[PDB]
Design an enzyme around this catalytic site. Structure first.
Site, short mmCIF file in Angstrom:
data_model
loop_
_atom_site.label_atom_id
_atom_site.label_comp_id
_atom_site.label_asym_id
_atom_site.label_seq_id
_atom_site.Cartn_x
_atom_site.Cartn_y
_atom_site.Cartn_z
N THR A 33 -1.21 11.27 13.69
CA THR A 33 -1.85 10.88 14.95
C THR A 33 -0.87 10.96 16.17
O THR A 33 -1.28 11.36 17.28
CB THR A 33 -2.54 9.49 14.84
OG1 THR A 33 -1.98 8.73 13.77
CG2 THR A 33 -4.01 9.65 14.40
N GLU A 79 2.81 -1.01 4.74
CA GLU A 79 2.54 -1.83 5.92
C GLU A 79 1.46 -2.85 5.72
O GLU A 79 1.45 -3.87 6.42
CB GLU A 79 2.25 -0.89 7.11
CG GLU A 79 0.84 -0.38 7.30
CD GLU A 79 0.50 0.92 6.62
OE1 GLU A 79 -0.37 1.64 7.18
OE2 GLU A 79 1.03 1.20 5.52
N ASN A 137 0.84 -1.17 0.00
CA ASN A 137 0.00 0.00 0.00
C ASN A 137 0.88 1.22 0.00
O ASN A 137 2.12 1.13 -0.13
CB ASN A 137 -0.94 -0.02 1.24
CG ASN A 137 -0.19 0.24 2.56
OD1 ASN A 137 0.86 -0.35 2.82
ND2 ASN A 137 -0.71 1.17 3.38
N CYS A 164 1.96 3.27 2.20
CA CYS A 164 2.94 3.40 3.30
C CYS A 164 3.66 2.10 3.71
O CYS A 164 4.35 2.06 4.71
CB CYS A 164 2.23 4.01 4.52
SG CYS A 164 1.49 5.61 4.14
N1 LIG Z 1 -1.40 11.65 1.30
C1 LIG Z 1 -2.21 10.60 1.53
N2 LIG Z 1 -3.39 10.44 0.86
C2 LIG Z 1 -4.20 9.38 1.10
N3 LIG Z 1 -3.89 8.42 2.00
C3 LIG Z 1 -2.74 8.45 2.73
C4 LIG Z 1 -1.82 9.58 2.53
N4 LIG Z 1 -0.78 9.40 3.36
C5 LIG Z 1 -1.00 8.24 4.04
N5 LIG Z 1 -2.17 7.68 3.66
C6 LIG Z 1 -2.72 6.41 4.23
O1 LIG Z 1 -2.72 6.50 5.67
C7 LIG Z 1 -2.31 5.25 6.23
C8 LIG Z 1 -1.57 5.38 7.55
O2 LIG Z 1 -0.64 6.46 7.49
P1 LIG Z 1 -0.42 7.30 8.83
O3 LIG Z 1 0.71 8.26 8.47
O4 LIG Z 1 -0.28 6.34 9.98
O5 LIG Z 1 -1.84 8.11 8.93
P2 LIG Z 1 -2.47 9.00 10.14
O6 LIG Z 1 -1.43 9.18 11.24
O7 LIG Z 1 -2.77 10.32 9.45
O8 LIG Z 1 -3.68 8.19 10.54
C9 LIG Z 1 -1.46 4.57 5.18
O9 LIG Z 1 -1.60 3.15 5.38
C10 LIG Z 1 -1.93 5.16 3.85
C11 LIG Z 1 -2.83 4.27 3.00
C12 LIG Z 1 -2.17 3.08 2.34
O10 LIG Z 1 -2.73 2.80 1.04
#
Ligand SMILES: Nc1ncnc2c1ncn2[C@@H]1O[C@H](COP(=O)(O)OP(=O)(O)O)[C@@H](O)[C@H]1CCO
Ligand SMILES: Nc1nc2c(ncn2[C@H]2C[C@H](O)[C@@H](COP(=O)(O)OP(=O)(O)OP(=O)(O)O)O2)c(=O)[nH]1
Ligand SMILES: Nc1nc2c(ncn2[C@H]2C[C@H](O)[C@@H](COP(=O)(O)OP(=O)(O)OP(=O)(O)O)O2)c(=O)[nH]1
Ligand SMILES: Nc1ncnc2c1ncn2[C@@H]1O[C@H](COP(=O)(O)OP(=O)(O)O)[C@@H](O)[C@H]1CCO
Ligand SMILES: [Mg+2]
Ligand SMILES: [Mg+2]
Lengths: 640, 640
Positions: free
Chosen positions: B514, B338, B334, B336
């Site tokens: 977060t 994971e 995905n 990121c």
């Molecule tokens: N710029 C972006 N647009 C859409 N989804 C995004 C993004 N950056 C991260 N994500 C999505 O957010 C997920 C977790 O990233 P994380 O950085 O843990 O998010 P939060 O601390 O904001 O909850 C990841 O598993 C990624 C999706 C994987 O397909």
């Protein structure tokens, strides 16, 4: 090249892609079986001496992109091409096939590029024009429409796309509680898809928009050559779909209101007085943004001066004078501004095109054989109907449209040649009259042949309730009597009784490449130069005939823009005859366009040519053709 | 802000877009009715003194993009947010709702951004991750997939997209007898759609590709900053989906073959020895283009050095050690790196994420309450299962996937905080042991809670035939015994008898935003600086406690990259404790990542940090984690 047609067809049918080992037949199962069943009759019908009907640039046109190739080597002789197309169009009807081969080989008419390219091949996509409705003001409708454009554009054929239903910049999105970024970002998506998809391994779409749309100021500017870049879509062509109200407000120096379609629903789904009532009501209700009409007008002209676009097609003219008005409101024309056909999310209008070579009918003194023209026009009409049934449609919306309404588009080429051959200046009364009688005969011929087709196979599905079912033919919708070289009453009597097979039959197109094959000037425009590094065949004959053709006269044609005016030792009669399009009044151009238009069912791709262009001159030209009742007021503006 | 939760919910529910006059409720019918039915109990449960659990940058994080706004003014207090989310997750189960509000408000755990944004609202799209299969090697499949990406990207959530099935540059197209222009032009289409669609009025996709694909050399270079531009897609992230064979060939200094998927079918639909047999056969059959493995390898490292990408995820590790291997071959992770979940043209893998705040379980001397951690982890597991059922899925492929296999992704934040709080250097034996016992407790807890859910509601639909149905848990697939702080045999006994409710449960994610809310360092990485213009809370306390905190010591932290090494008058025990990630061996990083990975079901987003980067150092790092059996060998490469 192998000489025997049946052996050329064999080689093509049996072709294998050596790099992959994949059989890649370049003839359809159907046409192969026909050739093989009739090979003596077909092989001996071809007169191979007719490849010398073409010229340097006309042969090297065919050889370079029309004549089918094996392993990068040309496998087809021109006569093979023509017989392949004749068969691809006519199938089992060998007699028809033979007649079409004979008339095309002697250069009486031709079919458009996609037909020449694809007739007789396994997925014969022979139609030149697609007019696509944006399916819905949603991500889904946008992405469904984009996909339909990519699938169409994979198999050649231009797209005219209308986008008046897409909500404008700043509009609310309820699902995400956000704001739309409007049309320009969406256009940019379409621009990228036209580039990605390059006719099977580049697209050209025209985009249509009514000028009340709130993003209109950026829309018109999309081909501009200077600054911003993420606000431009330089592989697309903007076209305005202009209501009369706009033109009125501009001439009145009044106001004009810009709306998002979500704030002012249904504008593009009405026309004329009903539009004018709905639009004025929305204006009074404070649903949009009011500006000075002449502010938009100025920006339009500035974009036409810099870029040649936007195109101008008159919405109300197109709808009031369409035989397709029982279908609903027409919301676009097409890439080249000649097709005016109804489209909707489930119906993508298609058209199949062919051009009559107008000089073939010239016969001390010269005359024009209109009776031979009428006869050839009916031949071509029947060919184009047959193309409808034999076509591979790239998407289902296009099969459903064409199968229902069966439009067709006859046109012409070598009008200017014809005049020159007949010694008539372009701006002469004689040329005016010839123009009218040519188009009157083509339209009569087309309708007579289509009526014959309706007595045989039934009228098109939606004929009932059409203006033609009620005896209203095209010139009636312009409130004019026909010139009367042909009997229109008997024709109309038969049409009202038996129907016609085609909703529409006439749309003189650009012929940008088919005229080159045949060696004539394009469609219905004057010559642009008497020198392209070779001089007008007709001018040349005359100069020689007067003993004034020398080096010191060759030069004042190279050096002088291919114009003979001002040239000391040339007779005035030559000067009048060989006027260039920059030397012919556009009022004369507009006038002749209006004369012919009463016999043109759809529209015609009227380029405009301004030498010393001012905002005032350009305004007069638009207003002149607008008030003449022109449907396509302007295709390109050619300048300088 | 209004104080009473029920009045805040009312205001939000009754919201109308004033500019359009459209009712735009920002609470779902369902959650509104629940609040109104329980308003005394809910209003009096909130402890508003807990908005001082947050900090300057953590509050100003929430206030700036999480707390719902009316007319551009914040309408939610943080406690209102938390109770809205608790209700959005739990619905009618007020007791559950109350427990989740209490534990989140006291910062034990949190849910990911989309949950915080969207829980309790009308189209609650609470899932963070989508993994999309390119639907087919055709214009249609390409444009269908593009549309699915646009629809997903309209409602927030990253996309990982795999494109190994798209035929490469120069490949034959039979329908048009043409040649494909390959992946880069197609990527450019996807890049434009990510830009056009901006989360409701900009996208980020990761693209996955196996390194035998023939366009691979350009694929890896897409974020490069220098010359060509029509060969770059700078809003997308390339990720390599690497088979062990590639790594073997590189270390062997042998050859590697590039194929078009049409010449070498099925590569991406097998793994391990079966892949190795099919790939070698195709190699021997002359179906592709052979090069030096180390030539590709060099180009990969050069792109990681310039751009931080491509990411590196190990295909065979991901497939051999997945509880989803009964579903078929997994073809991507995905955005990121994971999630490792199965996807196909009709199944788009989704995941819902939340992180445990590891410092909340610290309790003269300090200890770590693993029993409280196990308890909270089960709470969070049950929340994430509930999210599955209450989610709005933007496209049907994603509902079908999640409803079938019900994966979940628990993670963590504040690992580095935890160590520092407990006085353990990151690279210490004590920190090594704590890392293992933390992840062992989270995984045990998750599986125990999921088993409880399976006894209640039934196992997920595809549980039968899974490694877990046969008593093979994650650490078994790594051929290791667990550390044994928890009873794994009793757990496994119950799982084999009653099933689990979720196919997968653990995927430590970046927590990029977060952690900031909660005021902890992100996920499981060391600190990057002891100064961000504010200094490490822990370092600060110590410096003050030693009477060495002065201006002349504040400076050697601003000036010195937030590092305390080399600093004359600081104790060695501080120096060890406050090592920055540029100061910790990546072998130690890789080692700890391997230790935790035996308890991680999916993968984890392992960024790598190289100070003085050479092609040799980078190679060792990749090969080190590859041979450790890492699934995600590398997310970003951070340099310099
Ligand atoms: N710029 C972006 N647009 C859409 N989804 C995004 C993004 N950056 C991260 N994500 C999505 O957010 C997920 C977790 O990233 P994380 O950085 O843990 O998010 P939060 O601390 O904001 O909850 C990841 O598993 C990624 C999706 C994987 O397909
Ligand atoms: N750039 C570009 N790529 C195309 C074009 N047409 C097809 N492709 C690509 C997209 C796919 O990766 C591949 C196959 O596309 P299609 O399945 O739509 O081609 P078609 O079915 O007619 O031929 P096929 O039988 O599959 O070889 O070729 C095109 O016109 N332009
Ligand atoms: N740039 C951009 N435009 C969008 C986005 N989402 C929707 N739009 C545009 C496309 C359409 O012209 C218009 C409506 O799109 P949708 O129908 O997909 O939005 P939705 O149904 O969720 O809201 P609606 O009820 O129609 O207002 O807004 C987006 O995320 N980015
Ligand atoms: N670059 C292009 N790509 C696709 N279609 C094109 C095109 N240029 C023209 N056409 C399409 O070709 C039609 C007739 O143009 P014309 O210039 O008469 O074509 P040929 O002489 O080559 O037959 C027009 O009606 C236009 C379709 C309208 O939607
Ligand atoms: Mg909508
Ligand atoms: Mg195909």
């Amino acid at each position: 090249t192998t000489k025997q047609f049946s052996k050329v067809v064999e080689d093509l049918y049996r072709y294998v892609n050596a790099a992959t080992g994949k059989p890649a037949p370049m003839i359809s199962d159907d046409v192969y079986n026909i050739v093989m069943e009739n090979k003596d009759k077909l092989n001996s019908a071809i007169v191979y001496d007719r490849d010398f009907q073409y010229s340097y640039f006309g042969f090297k046109t065919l050889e370079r992109s029309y004549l089918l190739r094996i392993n990068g080597q040309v496998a087809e002789r021109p006569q093979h091409l023509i017989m392949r197309v004749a068969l691809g169009i006519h199938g089992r009807d060998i007699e028809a096939a033979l007649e079409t081969y004979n008339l095309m080989s002697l250069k009486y008419f031709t079919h458009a590029s996609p037909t020449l390219f694809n007739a007789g091949t396994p997925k014969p996509q022979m139609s030149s024009c697609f007019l696509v409705a944006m399916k819905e003001d949603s991500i889904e409708g946008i992405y469904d429409t984009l996909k339909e454009c990519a699938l169409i554009s994979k198999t050649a054929g231009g797209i005219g796309l209308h986008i008046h239903n897409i909500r404008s910049t700043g509009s609310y999105i309820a699902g995400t509680n956000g704001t739309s970024n409007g049309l320009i970002p969406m256009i940019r998506v379409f621009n990228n898809t036209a580039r990605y998809v390059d006719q099977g391994g580049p697209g050209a779409f025209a985009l249509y928009l009514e000028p009340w749309h709130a993003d209109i100021f950026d829309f018109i500017d999309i081909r501009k050559n200077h600054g911003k870049e993420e606000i431009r879509a330089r592989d697309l062509f903007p076209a305005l779909w202009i209501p009369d109200l706009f033109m009125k407000r501009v001439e009145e120096n009044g106001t004009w209101t810009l709306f998002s379609p979500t704030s002012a629903p249904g504008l593009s789904d009405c026309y004329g007085d009903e539009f004018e009532a709905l639009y004025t009501r929305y204006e009074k209700e404070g649903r949009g943004k009011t500006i000075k009409a002449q502010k938009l007008w100025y920006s339009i002209l500035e974009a036409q001066t810099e870029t040649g676009t936007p195109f101008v097609v008159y919405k109300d003219a197109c709808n009031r004078k369409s035989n397709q008005k029982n279908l609903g409101v027409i919301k676009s024309s097409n890439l080249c501004c000649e097709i005016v056909e109804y489209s909707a999310p489930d119906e993508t209008a298609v058209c199949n095109l062919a051009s009559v070579a107008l000089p073939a009918f010239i016969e001390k003194t010269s005359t024009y054989n209109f009776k031979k023209l009428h006869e050839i026009a009916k031949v071509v009409t029947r060919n184009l109907n047959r193309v409808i049934d034999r076509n591979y449609y790239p998407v289902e919306e296009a099969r459903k449209s064409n199968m229902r309404h069966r439009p067709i588009a006859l046109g012409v080429q070598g009008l200017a040649d014809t005049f020159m051959l007949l010694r008539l200046p372009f701006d002469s009364e004689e040329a005016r009259l010839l123009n009218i009688q040519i188009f009157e005969t083509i339209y009569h011929a087309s309708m007579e042949a289509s009526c014959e087709l309706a007595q045989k196979d039934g009228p098109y599905e939606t004929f009932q309730g059409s203006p033609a079912s009620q005896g209203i033919l095209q010139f009636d919708m312009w409130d004019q009597k026909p010139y009367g070289m042909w009997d229109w009453d008997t024709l109309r009597k038969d049409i009202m009784k038996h129907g016609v097979r085609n909703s529409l039959t006439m749309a003189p197109m650009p012929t940008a490449s088919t005229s080159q094959i045949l060696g004539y000037n394009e469609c219905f425009e004057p010559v642009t130069s008497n020198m392209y590094q070779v001089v007008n065949p007709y001018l040349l004959r005359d100069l020689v005939d007067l003993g004034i053709w020398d080096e010191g006269m060759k030069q004042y044609l190279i050096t002088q823009n291919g114009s003979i005016q001002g040239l000391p030792n040339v007779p005035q009669e030559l000067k009048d005859l060989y006027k260039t399009v920059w030397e012919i009044s556009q009022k004369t151009i507009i006038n002749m366009a209006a004369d012919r238009s009463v016999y043109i069912d759809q529209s015609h791709s009227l380029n405009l040519f301004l030498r010393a262009p001012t905002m005032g001159k350009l305004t007069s030209m638009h207003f002149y053709g607008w008030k003449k009742g022109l449907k396509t007021g302007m295709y390109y503006l050619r300048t300088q």
